[PDB]
Symmetry: D2
């Protein structure tokens, strides 16, 4: 019996995800937004407190991801490619600025399992973003000034977010993007009678990213809407105002995860 | 912060699955099969032992499920309905006959989450079974003698099982064993899972109706990223068809 | 070069659908509804007129279908099973009551192709209906008084219909438009096929029919016009099994 | 009643696809292959002739497409983006080299409709290709020498093609890529009793492309197999050997179609 996630198996192949390292290359459409600070605060776990400066601020990101591990798994895009929609919300952890992730959607079961392991609360969703093609022409925007990109996310056949950005200029400090560490919650419940309120795993974690790299980063304007949907609570973070729109490539590797609190 | 599974949330609605009770109603197309005893034994967790009498026996099941909880969730079929393929293998637990589940596939993320909590090692797949309709006619088999039912399962766009049964007669006890498993990602701990425990599936208010038995054809197909077909079908036993209903509120840690 | 629909092929296997007969067995969750007569009339093809008595009335149906042809194709549910949401609207054809189908969605490409040949204007979508299981219990409604069924339809990741019925009590030809455009420059407004047809169903059977109360809404969606037939009020909800065979189609 | 394809409608929005122009931008992973001449011949419509020089040769392509029309439809990727797998086979049309398309798969119903109108015989399938990311790192190949790219296609949950290419050098003559015009067959049957063998539309066509452009074109080595599947005949064109592998961006516009 071998393997990292379930199913464990004789050969350690069938598992949804193998052990790290997990490598990621992706292209991000992001939108800075502002919701009601109290609504942001309602989503925070114990151990996180409202950002004293930017309470209500969040980032919405629509990402086209390609995953690999140690054996050119990206040559199997049927399993290794996926698309992702998440939000983070500004908060503080012990007087430090962080980014809390309450909701996140992917179109891939391997990504869902990897996410749970990291404490990303992934559900399945349908996620799309406009692509820029080098060849150019009327089927594509320019990755440059004036370039317009749309992005959407649905869950269980219901549209939950729609965005558009228009690029204006290159990001001045690419390395500054996502300067806030991301905070998640590893959580795995018990089913034994009498223990449904006593999870086996329940711990705040900080995301740890190795060898992080950003390229081709642009900033501009943005439009964003969250839409009410049965069985979802995203739209309970209403978009009162949109800030900057962002487009960039992102790469990193996962090998670790920092447990803060159990 | 409220909720049973992630995402936890202010209202406890966003979670993939709320707390039990979980209620199920389903229709099963199933195939008794026999593989190499040694290949079956290779899949067994430490706490289980080969069945002294029927080592190599297993059961393949394709199920059209409908789930609900305490609020008529079955009125939301886009979430509550799912289709499932699983196999179990005969084994023993302390001299008592049980059914070990090594592989199982569903087409619903809520089901996948509920599964993991029960220790069912669910992955996503595409599962289908022939349905019987009471109106009858050339678009449907009869649910009765001569009725033919097909079923298939795929994962990541690859077919892994194909089956057919032919019903012959109406029908005139092995608990399922699973492994709750949740790994750690902290460096140095990737071999030290936070949850790793053998469990027995506990089912409340179980009911079976409309059970038929007959013949069966079955194949497992090799697929990248899967090991189901490492359990070759040397032969089939009975095919079977029935409705099944039960409620989950509990789980026994072994 | 064999086959009925594309792709044509050396063996006539690859086609999306072979020649009729096409057999169907299904379970229908449906809602009678009423929209604005003008909105319904705006969808009518040349050759159909408003119904003088029930203009505005329509029927919404969510169906779990199983198809087969001459070779027990229902043993291949990955191709043969599908789910369908459609509406019809009351109208007249030369003075006779008919049911015009403006919009229909299915979750299967074989079904789309069969539909197109019949003149059902199918697009892909995600369609779901509550199922009644004979075993009973808390995971299923019970067919009969008080049995509740939900149903939904989405298109391109957008919800476009939501419905619920409550059963209480036991218990018009469809007109379509075969339409295939031309792409030759100068001919984009001159379709190669454009003909009003009446649906012809062989050996039709209905069973275990119930009626009761209903709720129904069509939701606005980008790229869709269903919700431009707003539900002003609902009539009967209904539930039944349906079977028929298709071998023919009547050109009008 | 407005619209181009069905459904026709009061505003001409609901239709699967509106009238042309249809614009395309995509990234192609391609494999030159060789099957049995007689197998290729078997798929040919009346009107086409085996190629006297390269009978049995074809090209398999996996493409990540983005479509748009006159209103920035590419801002709605849920509808406008799709993935496509097709093969063409070398043939002749009246002494001239062409490329016959027998089978093609897409993961989008609007593409299926546009395809049928063009005579592309589209079915639904699931198609994927490895992508190159500019940022680089262990999650991506390099778009350059040594870059490896995989690709797969499935139909109805069955795998029907798997491919990998390894790039070596720039395509010497990008303009010449797929210089063979594609031949298709517009086909629409009748359902009236007695007419099931008398289709309403049945005509050989040549694909017409406007403003075609290619960029970032690379060539290298390739591996490819077609797999037997129920209800498919692709694998009846068995890959006996592979030739070149190709990677390039492709863009064009569709406004016309030539009936042969």
């Amino acid at each position: 019996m071998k393997g990292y996630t379930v199913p464990l198996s004789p050969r350690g192949i069938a598992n949804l995800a193998p052990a790290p390292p997990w490598h990621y290359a992706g292209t991000v459409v992001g939108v800075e937004f502002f919701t009601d600070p109290a609504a942001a605060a309602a989503t925070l776990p114990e151990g996180l407190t409202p950002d004293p400066d930017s309470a209500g601020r969040g980032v919405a990101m629509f990402i086209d991801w390609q995953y690999s591990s140690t054996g050119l798994e990206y040559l199997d895009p049927a399993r290794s490619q996926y698309r992702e929609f998440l939000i983070t919300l500004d908060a503080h952890c012990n007087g430090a600025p962080v980014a809390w992730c309450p909701y996140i959607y992917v179109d891939n079961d391997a990504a869902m399992a990897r996410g749970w392991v990291q404490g990303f609360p992934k559900k399945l969703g349908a996620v799309h973003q406009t692509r820029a093609y080098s060849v150019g022409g009327p089927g594509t925007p320019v990755l440059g000034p004036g370039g317009q990109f749309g992005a959407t996310a649905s869950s269980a056949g219901q549209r939950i977010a729609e965005a558009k950005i228009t690029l204006e200029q290159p990001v001045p400090d690419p390395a500054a993007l996502m300067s806030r560490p991301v905070i998640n919650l590893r959580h795995f419940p018990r089913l034994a009678a009498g223990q449904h309120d006593q999870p086996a795993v329940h711990e705040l974690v900080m995301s740890v990213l190795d060898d992080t790299a950003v390229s081709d980063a642009w900033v501009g304007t943005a439009d964003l809407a969250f839409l009410p949907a049965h069985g979802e609570e995203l739209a309970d973070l209403p978009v009162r105002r949109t800030g900057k729109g962002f487009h960039f490539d992102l790469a990193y590797t996962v090998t670790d995860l920092m447990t803060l609190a159990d």
